[PDB]
């Protein structure tokens, strides 16, 4: 039988091109540790976690990776958060949480935006799915407090692979590659972190110091996800934002930087289709375009560098000067200079580079419960009649 629409995302995957540095072969002559190997590859892509090894497509009791996911594959009262158009006529599809922290997509049918509703094959990746008309909903008065939606705080870092290692890196080119994602997963009603995440191209210790310090404040011990290559890389956090699926995504310049340099490759290196990694399943908008826009259907994409410069007077936006004058905490800088020799070094200096990619995704997660971007966001959506989205993007 399987699903009625085609989910589109990959749920399998026998080869990929394989791209990664030379020096990751420790084990190999100096003489062919410069560069990147180039080529495809017939196996499964995996992942790496604490010495156990998995398939990234591969979903069972035993993931390194949190999933809110009902189907993969076609496998097998509420709040809305966001709105979908799509044809079938058009349907109207509110996409939301039930106060048990259940992910619902009702289609509301015969058509010719932020709160608390109740009602009087699937199409999305959610728990449960209706179909109803507009005489089946009604607003739930008396509520207000947000549901346990999950925000996704992330941040890349990349290294430049040609004759020019300082080079600022670019998508196009298969030989600059993403080296590490870290990507921080927040309940944003209770604003507690709840999994600290470090996706690494190539094998990453991180320091017993950082470890120690993030034990001493009380947050979750982070979990490194080691790949051999950065296809294995992307498609394993495309995986995650896929089966975990957070409604609210934010960072520091991930509209005008990371989600461009991470959509260039998935698209133009690999060839991996996007329209099934959004709340949809396929057929789904996901799609940066130019300082630039983005839009993932399902997904609230906020850019902490947008809400500090519209609302902060300051000499500098660099995350670094911005934690300095806002959060009073002065972040030690790694420098991107340092990135190549340090990621050359092995995978003691690796960690190095992950402990401040963590740290840095840890003051965005701070900027972020401090200034609410959502809370003020969700407001005028509800106002001014339109959907948080449109609310964001839109003039
Ligand atoms: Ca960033
Ligand atoms: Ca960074």
Redesign the pocket.
Known sequence: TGPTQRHTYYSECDEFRFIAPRVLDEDAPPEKRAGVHDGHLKRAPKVYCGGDERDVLRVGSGGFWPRRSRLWGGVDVFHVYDILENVEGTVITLLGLTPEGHRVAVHVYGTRTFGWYRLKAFGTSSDVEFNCTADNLAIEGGMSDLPAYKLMCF???CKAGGEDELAFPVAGHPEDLVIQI?CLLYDLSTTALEHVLLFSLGSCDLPESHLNELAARGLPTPVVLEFDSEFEMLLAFMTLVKQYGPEFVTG?NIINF?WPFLLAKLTDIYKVPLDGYGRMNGRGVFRVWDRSKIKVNGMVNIDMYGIITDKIKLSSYK?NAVAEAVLKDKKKDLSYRDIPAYYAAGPAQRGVIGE??IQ??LLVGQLFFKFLPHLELSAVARLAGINITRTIYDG
């Open positions: 941040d890349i870092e870290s520091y990371d995350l401040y990619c840095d995704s």
